[PDB]
Design a protein around this nucleic acid. Structure first.
Ligand SMILES: [Zn+2]
Length: 256
DNA sequence: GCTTCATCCTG
DNA sequence: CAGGAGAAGCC
């Protein structure tokens, strides 16, 4: 679940309960139980995302921070209904007609304003690829800054301190799109390559967000999990190798 | 960057 | 039933 999936989730959560008075609130964690009575009657004002971090803001200035990491998942159901699953329920925010449920996630914390501005993660993450204000220009600027210009892409594209929201599938799909291997550094690219990379870093995540689900051609994986299969661009056989602690899918025939 | 955490999926 | 699929740890 990378930036695009998380924003899609957040949009569904907002459509479900944004602005509606909470009729019941439940948290699995003992440390969060105290907030149950405090939030009943309040309402979610908006669901903000920063990369894969999701922030559910409430009308009393509290904010529930949740990060699904590799296994958390939200579900929208009609109030009263309980999904058929073996997953562990961690949060229930219920309104008159709709209820949202967070399953499996382990990183869940209730934040006060002071904790928001200085949260370790929220404080170290870089600009969000889904942020409309972020442009290819600013992205190029970032890639060439002394801070990132010498970083190999294999690790850079997974680092949320560079651009928030990029995960392993976006990492491999972006690099394949621009024909680059994971060992490249922004400082060694020619102007044409840097431009393509800069645009792809924003356009692919935004394309997945807009079309992988919901919609309104369609996003699809070109190399992610297609190792052993022929590249649709050059026909070479896609390979898989571990780079920066995550499986790197790439085509030796058109990625250089 | 390497290892550990943490939950569900998979060979 | 290992260990594969995004952090925090360890600072
Ligand atoms: Zn190819």
């Amino acid at each position: 679940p990378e930036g695009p999936e998380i924003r899609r989730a957040a949009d569904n959560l907002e459509a479900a309960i944004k602005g509606k008075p909470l009729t019941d609130v439940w948290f699995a964690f003992p440390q969060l139980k105290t907030y149950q009575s405090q939030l009943i009657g309040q309402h979610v004002t908006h669901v903000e995302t920063r990369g894969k971090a999701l922030l559910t803001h409430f009308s009393n200035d509290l904010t529930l921070y949740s990060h699904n990491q590799l296994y958390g998942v939200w579900r929208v159901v009609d109030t009263g209904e309980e999904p058929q699953t073996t997953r562990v329920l961690r949060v229930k925010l219920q309104t008159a007609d709709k209820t949202i449920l967070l399953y499996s996630a382990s990183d869940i914390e209730m934040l006060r304003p002071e904790q928001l501005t200085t949260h370790p993660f929220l404080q170290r993450v870089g600009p969000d690829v889904l942020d409309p204000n972020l442009t290819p220009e600013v992205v190029k600027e970032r890639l060439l800054s002394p801070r990132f210009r010498n970083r190999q892409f294999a690790g850079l594209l997974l680092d949320q301190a560079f651009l928030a929201g990029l995960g392993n599938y976006l990492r491999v799909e972006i690099l394949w799109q621009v024909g680059l291997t994971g060992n490249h550094k922004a400082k060694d690219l020619n102007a044409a390559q840097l431009d393509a990379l800069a645009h792809a870093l924003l356009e692919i995540p935004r394309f997945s967000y807009a079309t992988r689900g919901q919609v309104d051609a369609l996003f699809r994986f070109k190399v992610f999990h297609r190792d052993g299969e022929p590249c649709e661009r050059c026909g070479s056989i896609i390979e898989k190798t571990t780079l920066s602690s995550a499986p790197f899918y790439w085509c030796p025939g058109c990625q250089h």
